[PDB]
Amino acid sequence: SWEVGCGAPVPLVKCDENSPYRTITGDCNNRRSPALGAANRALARWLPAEYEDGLALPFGWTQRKTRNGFRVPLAREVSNKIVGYLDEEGVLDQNRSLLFMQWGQIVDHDLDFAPETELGSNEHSKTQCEEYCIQGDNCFPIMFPKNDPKLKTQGKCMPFFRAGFVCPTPPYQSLAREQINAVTSFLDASLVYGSEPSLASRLRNLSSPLGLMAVNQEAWDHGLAYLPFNNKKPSPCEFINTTARVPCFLAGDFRASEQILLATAHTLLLREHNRLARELKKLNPHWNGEKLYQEARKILGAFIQIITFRDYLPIVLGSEMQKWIPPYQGYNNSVDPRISNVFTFAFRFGHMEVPSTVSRLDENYQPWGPEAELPLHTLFFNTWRIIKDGGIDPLVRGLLAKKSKLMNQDKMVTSELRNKLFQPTHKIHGFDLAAINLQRCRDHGMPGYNSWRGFCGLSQPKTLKGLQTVLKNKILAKKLMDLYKTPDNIDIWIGGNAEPMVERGRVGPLLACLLGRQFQQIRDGDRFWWENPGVFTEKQRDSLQKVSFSRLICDNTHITKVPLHAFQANNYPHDFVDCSTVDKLDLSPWASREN
Ligand code: HEM
Ligand SMILES: *[C@@H]1O[C@H](CO)[C@@H](O[C@@H]2O[C@H](CO)[C@@H](O)[C@H](O)[C@H]2NC(C)=O)[C@H](O)[C@H]1NC(C)=O
Ligand SMILES: *[C@@H]1O[C@H](CO)[C@@H](O)[C@H](O)[C@H]1NC(C)=O
Ligand SMILES: *[C@@H]1O[C@H](CO)[C@@H](O)[C@H](O)[C@H]1NC(C)=O
Ligand SMILES: *[C@@H]1O[C@H](CO)[C@@H](O)[C@H](O)[C@H]1NC(C)=O
Ligand SMILES: [Ca+2]
């Protein structure tokens, strides 16, 4: 009646509602509707898609087609006129560590991923955009505006391919196009363990019966483990230094080597699983491999949940934390736990938190080596700088002692991302993440800024002066009106990120509402939430309350000096303490069974 009843994923999945553990795919979390929150299904629509033709074609696709009577601006022009800035001085966050930015990317990768269509590049399909910039089908290139420097140096466009959609692949009709979420919507450490059975098994050490995750066999970090290499060619991590020839890492998530501090974070997370699996073997020598894997996995998922909801979200949402995410009251099976399409743009706020450089620091937290600080763009797809140039310990100290970029209406996105982004199969450090984000909003059929203001119960500015009051910025509002002609047409990514930040937070009201709702739903709609009665024992839960990121670092590096509050801006040695000061995770309550 209402829909075509589309069933894209393998419709066949057996549940076994006895099981104490999550599935890898996210299936069977919800008993009534077992596909809810599972990978490889459509992103949720909180509002109906808005396409130029009602169905599929992004706004901007057809030159003569207006949105509400006006042409949508070129995404790269928006980027150049609004998002870009020259001066990196004065741009850092005096009260957020670089680790704050990094955790955000980690959580994001746990929750959502809308891969571009035709997930493996075949033949010369992509001579369309890359070579000749011809818009057609899934080819939706980002065209340069006149007077853009990149015109002189790089050609007429940046290539951009449309995101994958559910029912068919290249064709579709009789319904609006719905993009795919290829990972589980639950905050479940899927970035570590995988979202498909297949990857999930390849990541494991099945050779031993200790419940370990596979580790690198070709390299070590003062004996501490690295992730296995992904030996798929062609490797971007190889392409960026064919002399080192150090390939990308293989992780539960495809994007783990996009930048060195993300690869770093994934490495910490792997070690913690192996560490937990060893402690569980000691206490329970009678537990088999499978038991040890699941129980470690379960602890690790709880860890990410706690860090996120107890430490991270409060200092993102600030004053609005309590409004959108009140204290836990138990699993509710009527709550939809699926990630919305809009959320996958709202969480891009992190793009304005990425600074232009990364530092390696020694044990006195001083520059590590002559080239301790590096431009961010030299670190995309960069594994060799880990394997061959100090392991993760120096980078982790940088995450603690260096600062995030602060979002700034006059300095939104560093040119390292806005001009120097590298993407696989594109060969150059010359893309623009901002422009991509805006093109993707259109690709995904996003409602515009005032639709979402309306959704969130917020005023909907119609005039320049209305917009000035909401943004509390006259020039920004003017540039936005010059480009969009109406606030109704402002892309959600830029509109949302334009708004001044809420007290004690790092996003504005609109984003706090959109993020706040999504996270509430992730928690309340999850049958395996760590605090749901039955998931963990009383005593297990008492031990998990004492997890911290500080302690993750101590147990999984050879770092012995850490802050107590790692997401804060911390200066060494004053704000730093010895590792012995810090609570450990007490695994006693996982002792087989009591006397
Ligand atoms: C150097 C750091 C980072 C790089 C290089 C980076 C790069 C990227 C790229 C290339 C995409 C895909 C763009 C597209 O095709 O539409 C992306 C998407 C995204 N990024 Fe970032 N990003 C970074 C940091 C962050 C941070 C700090 C956050 C959040 C706090 C974040 C959240 C997201 C999200 C949610 C997506 C959409 C994922 C999806 O559902 O497909 N990123 N990022
Ligand atoms: C590619 O990686 C190599 C190392 O794998 C980098 O060079 C090493 O780095 C410096 C170069 O001055 C020295 O320690 C060694 O002489 C280099 N080793 C080798 C094998 O040459 C090199 O700079 C990297 N290139 C890029 C562009 O990243
Ligand atoms: C810095 O951030 C934390 C939030 O976690 C807050 O408790 C602390 O008071 C802040 N410092 C400032 C800006 O006063
Ligand atoms: C798996 O387990 C054994 C014992 O710890 C170890 O020696 C072996 O190298 C591991 N295999 C991989 C690839 O992680
Ligand atoms: C559960 O969640 C929905 C929100 O989607 C709410 O309307 C409903 O009252 C809740 N019911 C329970 C069981 O608390
Ligand atoms: Ca997940």
XYZ file of C-alpha atoms and ligand atoms in Angstrom:
709
model
C 0.000 0.000 0.000
C 2.460 2.613 1.277
C 5.764 1.398 -0.221
C 7.032 -1.206 -2.711
C 8.224 -3.286 0.284
C 11.802 -3.076 -0.994
C 14.131 -5.770 0.415
C 17.648 -4.938 -0.794
C 19.924 -6.853 1.684
C 19.891 -10.656 1.696
C 16.275 -11.016 3.003
C 17.429 -14.214 4.743
C 18.767 -13.769 8.304
C 18.105 -16.138 11.238
C 17.870 -14.455 14.642
C 18.284 -16.824 17.648
C 16.841 -14.354 20.187
C 18.464 -16.519 22.873
C 21.879 -15.050 21.975
C 23.648 -12.837 24.557
C 25.699 -11.107 21.834
C 25.019 -8.656 19.009
C 25.133 -9.948 15.450
C 27.833 -8.437 13.241
C 25.258 -7.048 10.777
C 23.078 -5.424 13.463
C 20.170 -7.719 12.599
C 18.040 -9.109 15.452
C 18.604 -6.167 17.825
C 14.922 -5.283 17.567
C 12.683 -8.313 17.990
C 9.544 -6.967 16.286
C 11.431 -5.531 13.274
C 14.782 -7.423 13.091
C 16.245 -5.390 10.184
C 16.057 -2.059 12.131
C 19.525 -0.519 12.533
C 21.182 -3.289 10.475
C 23.905 -2.461 7.916
C 23.318 -2.354 4.156
C 19.781 -0.884 4.472
C 18.466 2.616 3.653
C 19.305 5.564 5.874
C 16.159 6.745 7.686
C 14.169 9.746 6.348
C 13.019 12.038 9.189
C 11.641 14.279 6.495
C 10.870 13.343 2.864
C 13.676 13.574 0.334
C 13.798 16.746 -1.743
C 14.969 16.196 -5.296
C 14.689 18.456 -8.354
C 12.335 15.931 -10.000
C 10.665 14.602 -6.821
C 12.441 11.244 -7.247
C 16.199 11.156 -7.662
C 17.847 14.110 -9.450
C 19.804 16.404 -7.085
C 19.084 20.113 -6.914
C 21.605 21.816 -9.181
C 21.496 18.970 -11.714
C 19.507 20.879 -14.338
C 20.565 24.482 -15.016
C 17.042 25.713 -15.844
C 15.468 24.107 -12.732
C 15.256 26.497 -9.803
C 14.841 25.639 -6.159
C 11.934 27.839 -4.972
C 12.498 30.140 -7.920
C 16.278 30.576 -7.556
C 19.313 28.737 -8.890
C 21.312 26.809 -6.313
C 24.930 28.092 -6.091
C 27.900 25.978 -7.210
C 29.169 24.050 -4.194
C 32.777 25.159 -4.813
C 31.733 28.821 -4.972
C 30.047 28.449 -1.573
C 33.267 26.806 -0.358
C 35.509 29.612 -1.706
C 33.319 32.527 -0.621
C 32.208 31.273 2.793
C 34.159 28.261 3.988
C 37.756 29.239 3.105
C 40.416 31.214 5.017
C 44.171 31.948 4.869
C 45.358 32.642 8.408
C 45.790 29.659 10.725
C 46.885 31.920 13.606
C 44.302 32.297 16.384
C 42.140 29.414 15.098
C 42.721 26.709 17.753
C 40.318 25.565 20.501
C 41.667 26.666 23.872
C 39.449 24.092 25.614
C 39.398 21.030 23.340
C 42.279 18.594 22.767
C 42.937 17.235 19.259
C 41.583 13.972 20.649
C 38.138 15.659 20.729
C 38.125 15.964 16.951
C 39.413 12.438 16.645
C 36.794 10.741 18.830
C 34.101 12.450 16.756
C 35.426 10.828 13.540
C 35.603 7.450 15.327
C 32.016 7.601 16.550
C 30.899 8.779 13.126
C 32.584 5.795 11.481
C 30.873 3.465 13.946
C 27.486 4.875 12.924
C 27.270 5.639 9.233
C 28.759 5.230 5.782
C 27.051 5.931 2.454
C 29.519 4.504 -0.126
C 29.540 5.855 -3.697
C 27.850 3.574 -6.248
C 29.623 0.684 -8.026
C 31.708 0.003 -4.928
C 34.534 -1.541 -7.007
C 35.934 0.511 -9.915
C 35.585 -1.520 -13.125
C 37.127 -0.881 -16.561
C 37.217 2.807 -17.542
C 33.675 3.607 -16.372
C 35.120 6.747 -14.750
C 36.603 8.417 -17.813
C 33.392 10.448 -17.637
C 34.028 12.742 -14.669
C 37.737 12.338 -14.094
C 38.779 13.121 -17.688
C 36.027 15.123 -19.407
C 33.805 16.406 -16.548
C 30.573 15.178 -18.196
C 27.591 15.034 -15.836
C 25.679 11.819 -16.398
C 24.064 9.100 -14.276
C 26.128 8.696 -11.087
C 28.629 11.271 -12.434
C 27.829 14.609 -10.784
C 31.098 16.587 -10.980
C 31.800 19.659 -8.862
C 32.391 22.399 -11.439
C 34.823 25.238 -10.628
C 33.411 28.806 -10.667
C 35.106 31.459 -12.791
C 38.108 33.074 -11.111
C 38.842 29.925 -9.096
C 42.635 29.207 -8.945
C 42.097 25.472 -9.445
C 40.753 26.206 -12.948
C 44.273 27.313 -13.881
C 45.956 24.233 -12.368
C 43.603 21.237 -12.220
C 40.993 21.461 -15.006
C 37.297 22.366 -15.101
C 35.961 20.168 -12.277
C 36.569 17.939 -9.297
C 35.062 14.468 -9.890
C 32.138 13.485 -7.672
C 30.199 10.221 -7.837
C 26.676 9.764 -6.456
C 26.132 7.687 -3.324
C 24.730 4.131 -3.525
C 20.945 3.590 -3.171
C 18.916 0.575 -2.077
C 16.337 -1.032 -4.340
C 18.368 -1.368 -7.617
C 21.752 0.161 -8.472
C 21.978 2.521 -11.582
C 18.169 2.420 -12.315
C 15.176 3.244 -10.052
C 11.618 4.663 -10.291
C 8.188 4.952 -8.581
C 9.758 6.097 -5.260
C 12.338 8.593 -3.993
C 15.948 7.392 -4.005
C 17.245 6.257 -0.611
C 21.003 6.125 0.115
C 22.524 3.110 1.943
C 24.055 2.955 5.404
C 26.730 0.276 5.012
C 27.541 -0.002 8.742
C 25.403 -0.789 11.800
C 23.443 2.160 13.249
C 24.145 0.900 16.802
C 27.157 2.219 18.715
C 28.659 -1.244 18.705
C 32.408 -1.023 17.796
C 31.514 -2.068 14.240
C 34.488 0.034 13.125
C 36.689 -2.533 14.906
C 34.891 -5.800 14.205
C 33.168 -5.148 10.851
C 29.516 -4.931 9.724
C 29.584 -7.972 7.336
C 30.261 -11.644 8.487
C 32.940 -11.932 5.934
C 35.175 -9.042 6.918
C 34.376 -9.890 10.540
C 35.970 -13.335 10.172
C 38.975 -12.129 8.136
C 39.755 -9.683 10.973
C 39.912 -12.515 13.499
C 42.719 -14.787 14.706
C 41.072 -18.135 14.144
C 44.454 -19.936 14.020
C 44.740 -19.649 17.832
C 41.750 -20.356 20.167
C 42.264 -17.275 22.323
C 39.566 -15.060 20.772
C 42.125 -12.575 19.423
C 41.811 -10.226 16.475
C 44.376 -10.707 13.692
C 47.524 -8.558 14.027
C 50.253 -7.353 11.670
C 52.940 -10.032 11.232
C 55.359 -7.821 9.267
C 55.745 -4.951 11.786
C 55.529 -4.207 15.512
C 55.483 -1.135 17.770
C 58.033 -1.796 20.524
C 56.304 -5.177 20.668
C 52.809 -3.621 20.777
C 50.533 -4.684 17.933
C 49.578 -3.040 14.662
C 46.528 -3.689 12.472
C 47.016 -6.165 9.562
C 47.768 -4.659 6.168
C 45.060 -4.697 3.547
C 46.823 -6.353 0.616
C 44.209 -5.174 -1.915
C 45.857 -3.303 -4.810
C 45.815 -0.536 -5.808
C 46.538 0.874 -2.348
C 46.199 4.663 -1.777
C 48.592 4.349 1.164
C 51.126 2.889 -1.277
C 50.332 5.494 -3.948
C 51.304 8.336 -1.539
C 54.815 6.904 -1.157
C 55.818 4.260 -3.684
C 59.287 4.212 -2.070
C 58.055 3.176 1.370
C 55.381 0.851 -0.112
C 53.503 0.600 3.210
C 49.855 -0.336 2.435
C 46.652 0.704 4.185
C 45.487 -1.058 7.330
C 42.646 -3.584 7.371
C 40.041 -2.616 9.947
C 36.372 -3.263 10.718
C 35.735 -0.054 8.769
C 36.972 0.727 5.256
C 38.149 4.289 6.012
C 40.569 3.496 8.845
C 43.677 4.862 7.033
C 42.120 8.068 5.653
C 44.392 9.972 8.055
C 47.145 8.899 10.437
C 45.368 9.890 13.686
C 42.332 7.797 12.695
C 44.646 4.837 12.005
C 46.189 5.584 15.382
C 42.769 5.479 17.081
C 41.867 2.172 15.359
C 45.195 0.720 16.562
C 44.448 1.603 20.180
C 41.054 -0.054 19.810
C 42.448 -3.306 18.408
C 45.037 -3.585 21.220
C 42.308 -3.150 23.817
C 40.400 -6.113 22.352
C 43.466 -8.378 22.405
C 44.278 -7.092 25.914
C 40.736 -7.913 27.122
C 40.808 -11.334 25.456
C 44.008 -12.233 27.357
C 42.685 -11.177 30.776
C 39.480 -13.157 30.089
C 41.530 -16.256 29.205
C 43.456 -16.013 32.483
C 40.273 -15.741 34.574
C 38.369 -18.231 32.402
C 40.801 -20.773 30.846
C 37.741 -22.919 30.066
C 36.204 -20.279 27.727
C 36.795 -21.126 24.026
C 37.871 -18.728 21.247
C 34.326 -17.677 20.291
C 33.454 -16.883 23.913
C 36.575 -14.745 24.379
C 36.014 -12.831 21.125
C 32.369 -12.026 21.949
C 33.037 -11.098 25.595
C 35.929 -8.774 24.659
C 33.905 -7.314 21.769
C 31.034 -6.745 24.214
C 33.311 -4.909 26.684
C 34.836 -2.820 23.871
C 31.390 -1.769 22.592
C 30.389 -0.781 26.122
C 33.631 1.240 26.358
C 32.861 3.261 23.216
C 29.288 3.835 24.395
C 30.422 5.152 27.782
C 33.219 7.377 26.489
C 30.810 8.805 23.917
C 27.754 9.451 26.079
C 29.529 10.302 29.356
C 32.552 12.265 28.067
C 32.045 13.362 24.456
C 28.410 14.286 23.915
C 28.159 16.652 26.951
C 30.985 18.815 25.555
C 29.465 18.737 22.095
C 25.844 19.489 23.020
C 26.591 21.611 26.125
C 23.423 23.187 27.556
C 21.275 21.067 25.242
C 22.630 17.702 26.407
C 19.914 17.280 29.050
C 17.108 18.501 26.771
C 17.772 15.904 24.019
C 19.480 13.100 25.970
C 17.965 12.831 29.509
C 19.468 10.155 31.816
C 18.899 6.545 30.719
C 15.544 4.952 31.610
C 15.953 1.608 29.796
C 15.565 -0.028 26.388
C 12.490 1.105 24.463
C 11.667 -1.121 21.512
C 9.344 1.464 19.904
C 12.298 3.822 19.284
C 13.736 3.788 15.756
C 17.534 3.240 16.095
C 18.400 3.782 12.413
C 20.782 6.619 11.470
C 18.951 9.335 9.540
C 20.274 10.721 6.273
C 20.346 14.217 7.877
C 22.556 13.007 10.747
C 25.258 11.940 8.289
C 25.524 15.660 7.390
C 24.991 17.066 10.895
C 27.961 15.091 12.237
C 30.211 16.642 9.535
C 30.580 19.549 11.987
C 33.840 17.818 12.811
C 35.278 19.021 9.478
C 35.557 22.532 11.009
C 37.418 21.093 14.004
C 40.367 19.659 12.042
C 43.533 21.812 12.391
C 46.141 22.247 9.673
C 48.989 20.273 11.349
C 49.806 17.118 13.326
C 52.607 16.798 15.886
C 54.657 13.888 17.212
C 55.848 14.358 20.817
C 58.387 12.490 22.984
C 58.153 11.385 26.636
C 58.789 14.925 27.920
C 56.092 15.940 25.387
C 58.504 18.050 23.352
C 58.961 17.969 19.538
C 59.836 14.400 18.569
C 62.575 14.743 15.931
C 63.364 17.593 13.464
C 60.109 17.177 11.499
C 57.872 16.574 14.541
C 55.113 18.768 13.060
C 53.687 18.001 9.604
C 50.955 19.557 7.376
C 47.760 17.520 7.627
C 47.596 16.950 3.851
C 50.824 14.893 3.896
C 49.106 12.508 6.348
C 46.109 11.338 4.300
C 46.382 7.614 3.561
C 49.673 7.650 5.468
C 50.607 4.423 7.234
C 54.345 4.490 6.657
C 54.749 7.432 9.079
C 53.430 5.030 11.717
C 55.255 1.849 10.670
C 58.593 3.492 9.874
C 58.644 6.662 11.996
C 57.870 6.002 15.656
C 54.712 3.864 15.974
C 51.591 5.323 17.573
C 52.971 6.563 20.900
C 54.286 9.959 19.612
C 51.055 10.665 17.698
C 48.917 9.842 20.721
C 50.834 12.415 22.792
C 50.010 14.968 20.106
C 46.328 14.004 20.383
C 46.558 14.761 24.126
C 48.678 17.921 24.148
C 47.658 19.615 20.908
C 44.318 21.314 20.297
C 41.386 20.893 17.905
C 40.547 23.689 15.526
C 37.702 25.819 16.870
C 34.751 26.401 14.567
C 34.775 30.035 13.403
C 32.271 31.865 11.182
C 35.225 33.593 9.449
C 37.512 30.517 9.360
C 35.434 27.410 8.758
C 37.530 24.733 7.054
C 41.353 24.607 6.778
C 42.722 24.662 3.236
C 44.422 21.350 4.014
C 40.932 19.814 3.634
C 39.377 22.499 1.479
C 42.133 22.543 -1.161
C 44.544 19.670 -0.527
C 42.294 16.632 0.124
C 43.430 13.372 -1.451
C 40.955 10.745 -2.567
C 41.767 7.227 -3.881
C 41.935 6.796 -7.687
C 42.209 10.606 -8.071
C 46.014 10.821 -7.698
C 46.184 14.444 -6.491
C 46.118 16.319 -3.187
C 43.720 18.857 -4.689
C 40.103 18.173 -3.621
C 37.755 20.144 -1.366
C 35.915 18.444 1.484
C 33.588 21.409 1.960
C 32.480 21.388 -1.681
C 32.068 17.609 -1.516
C 29.896 17.931 1.589
C 27.574 20.432 -0.111
C 27.389 18.394 -3.319
C 26.545 15.361 -1.177
C 23.684 17.180 0.567
C 22.151 17.668 -2.858
C 23.009 14.100 -3.902
C 21.181 12.817 -0.789
C 18.035 14.915 -1.454
C 18.475 16.955 1.716
C 15.722 19.385 2.792
C 17.148 22.897 3.146
C 17.967 24.916 6.252
C 14.487 26.254 7.121
C 12.844 22.833 6.761
C 15.241 21.612 9.458
C 14.840 24.783 11.564
C 11.103 23.969 11.382
C 11.686 20.313 12.326
C 13.673 21.433 15.394
C 11.053 24.005 16.480
C 13.290 26.982 15.645
C 12.532 30.293 13.928
C 12.738 30.172 10.135
C 14.502 33.367 8.886
C 13.158 34.612 5.529
C 15.056 37.933 5.194
C 18.692 38.963 5.309
C 18.001 40.737 8.640
C 16.226 37.643 9.938
C 19.273 35.582 9.000
C 21.637 38.145 10.532
C 19.882 37.810 13.883
C 19.967 33.985 13.826
C 23.655 33.816 12.790
C 24.542 36.892 14.867
C 26.786 37.795 11.918
C 25.941 40.425 9.334
C 28.598 39.717 6.671
C 28.197 35.922 6.789
C 24.417 36.288 6.482
C 24.951 38.658 3.548
C 27.295 36.276 1.712
C 24.813 33.448 2.314
C 21.948 35.555 0.926
C 24.089 36.655 -2.023
C 24.690 33.015 -2.905
C 21.365 31.408 -1.963
C 18.933 34.365 -2.323
C 16.727 32.734 0.341
C 17.520 30.964 3.654
C 15.117 28.198 2.560
C 17.743 27.183 -0.031
C 20.773 27.041 2.260
C 22.327 23.557 2.349
C 21.927 21.957 5.797
C 25.681 21.347 6.261
C 26.669 25.010 5.868
C 23.470 26.452 7.360
C 23.790 24.318 10.474
C 27.520 24.973 10.897
C 27.007 28.739 10.434
C 25.061 29.085 13.699
C 26.971 30.247 16.846
C 27.694 27.492 19.356
C 25.424 26.760 22.351
C 26.727 27.439 25.859
C 29.293 24.791 26.832
C 29.018 23.063 23.433
C 30.661 23.101 19.994
C 27.585 23.157 17.764
C 24.704 25.600 17.355
C 20.982 25.006 18.186
C 19.919 23.318 14.949
C 22.812 20.836 15.015
C 22.344 20.204 18.764
C 18.723 19.232 18.038
C 19.599 17.006 15.045
C 22.564 15.314 16.798
C 20.738 15.228 20.141
C 17.736 13.335 18.736
C 19.851 10.846 16.803
C 22.022 9.922 19.774
C 18.980 9.619 22.048
C 17.577 7.114 19.551
C 20.890 5.164 19.230
C 20.842 4.672 22.971
C 17.131 4.180 23.708
C 16.540 1.953 20.650
C 19.459 -0.421 21.445
C 18.646 -3.769 23.105
C 22.336 -4.298 23.893
C 22.999 -0.884 25.444
C 25.576 -1.443 28.229
C 23.177 -0.141 30.942
C 20.139 -2.081 29.733
C 19.245 -4.449 32.632
C 20.302 -7.962 31.627
C 23.110 -6.985 29.239
C 25.754 -6.765 31.982
C 25.642 -7.849 35.637
C 25.348 -5.284 38.447
C 29.030 -5.817 39.287
C 30.269 -5.813 35.694
C 28.489 -2.481 35.289
C 30.198 -1.075 38.399
C 33.586 -1.842 36.794
C 32.598 -0.340 33.400
C 31.641 2.978 35.068
C 35.394 3.355 35.780
C 36.534 3.259 32.108
C 38.361 6.275 30.691
C 40.249 7.183 27.512
C 43.269 8.098 29.641
C 43.301 4.483 30.825
C 42.882 3.081 27.295
C 46.140 4.867 26.404
C 48.025 3.657 29.514
C 47.085 -0.011 28.967
C 47.734 -0.006 25.175
C 50.835 2.204 24.656
C 54.026 2.788 26.674
C 52.779 6.218 27.731
C 52.802 6.722 31.507
C 51.766 10.396 31.754
C 48.176 11.327 30.757
C 45.458 13.906 31.621
C 42.449 12.831 33.635
C 40.114 14.600 31.196
C 41.547 13.890 27.717
C 39.005 15.840 25.629
C 39.871 19.038 27.518
C 42.786 21.145 26.349
C 45.684 19.794 28.429
C 49.179 21.226 28.844
C 52.126 19.144 30.038
C 53.364 18.741 32.648
C 50.848 20.622 34.791
C 47.590 18.963 33.696
C 49.267 15.534 33.357
C 49.533 12.752 35.978
C 51.252 9.358 36.170
C 49.273 6.361 34.849
C 49.181 4.863 38.365
C 46.793 7.684 39.376
C 44.137 6.416 36.958
C 41.402 3.830 37.575
C 41.747 0.528 35.716
C 38.929 -1.581 34.331
C 38.392 -4.324 36.905
C 37.619 -7.589 35.082
C 36.977 -9.581 38.299
C 33.168 -9.592 37.754
C 33.676 -11.564 34.501
C 35.049 -14.511 36.510
C 33.402 -17.608 34.990
C 30.843 -17.999 37.807
C 31.008 -17.420 41.556
C 31.251 -19.687 44.618
C 41.404 14.761 8.727
C 40.186 14.439 9.179
C 39.033 14.027 8.349
C 38.998 13.742 7.027
C 40.218 13.698 6.144
C 37.648 13.507 6.634
C 37.282 13.120 5.322
C 35.995 12.744 4.967
C 35.573 12.358 3.640
C 36.445 12.240 2.412
C 34.264 12.066 3.681
C 33.434 11.576 2.520
C 32.836 12.763 1.814
C 31.738 12.480 0.821
O 32.039 11.836 -0.211
O 30.573 12.968 0.970
C 33.854 12.311 5.025
C 32.591 12.092 5.447
C 32.258 12.254 6.800
N 32.983 12.753 7.802
Fe 34.788 13.400 7.727
N 36.858 13.661 7.702
C 37.607 14.001 8.768
C 37.183 14.260 10.063
C 35.897 14.093 10.517
C 35.455 14.362 11.815
C 36.344 14.914 12.906
C 34.111 14.037 11.860
C 33.149 14.156 12.953
C 33.400 14.679 14.150
C 33.762 13.565 10.550
C 32.512 13.132 10.170
C 32.179 12.727 8.880
C 30.916 12.119 8.543
C 29.680 11.841 9.347
C 30.940 11.826 7.268
C 29.782 11.182 6.494
C 29.959 9.628 6.584
C 28.885 8.849 5.828
O 27.746 8.519 6.342
O 29.166 8.514 4.641
N 34.867 13.631 9.784
N 34.912 12.751 5.813
C 58.877 7.828 1.463
O 59.315 7.104 2.603
C 60.734 7.168 2.819
C 60.966 6.159 3.931
O 60.235 4.953 3.699
C 61.113 8.626 3.114
O 62.526 8.820 3.269
C 63.144 8.223 4.373
O 62.900 9.471 5.010
C 64.124 10.262 5.058
C 64.319 10.966 3.716
O 65.189 12.101 3.819
C 65.340 9.417 5.470
O 65.156 8.927 6.807
C 65.618 8.218 4.556
O 66.718 8.497 3.697
C 64.433 7.784 3.695
N 64.452 6.367 3.403
C 64.558 5.931 2.148
C 64.314 4.467 1.928
O 64.827 6.700 1.228
C 60.669 9.511 1.956
O 60.962 10.884 2.217
C 59.178 9.317 1.680
N 58.728 10.227 0.643
C 57.587 10.930 0.739
C 57.280 11.885 -0.375
O 56.822 10.792 1.688
C 36.713 23.634 29.596
O 35.837 22.557 29.286
C 35.243 21.813 30.373
C 34.132 21.006 29.733
O 34.420 19.611 29.765
C 34.724 22.695 31.509
O 34.367 21.857 32.606
C 35.774 23.722 31.917
O 35.269 24.614 32.904
C 36.155 24.545 30.693
N 36.993 25.694 30.984
C 36.542 26.946 30.836
C 36.415 27.451 29.428
O 36.227 27.632 31.804
C 47.307 -15.656 16.442
O 47.690 -16.269 17.671
C 49.052 -16.730 17.846
C 49.221 -16.891 19.335
O 49.062 -15.636 19.985
C 50.065 -15.749 17.257
O 51.413 -16.190 17.443
C 49.743 -15.590 15.779
O 50.740 -14.813 15.133
C 48.384 -14.903 15.641
N 48.016 -14.671 14.255
C 47.689 -13.472 13.738
C 47.807 -13.349 12.250
O 47.301 -12.523 14.423
C 9.151 4.751 23.622
O 9.551 5.646 22.588
C 8.546 6.418 21.891
C 9.300 7.428 21.041
O 9.635 6.921 19.744
C 7.606 7.087 22.887
O 6.590 7.807 22.194
C 6.950 6.025 23.750
O 6.091 6.622 24.710
C 7.988 5.211 24.515
N 7.342 4.095 25.176
C 7.881 3.498 26.238
C 7.727 2.007 26.313
O 8.493 4.139 27.086
Ca 27.913 0.647 14.398
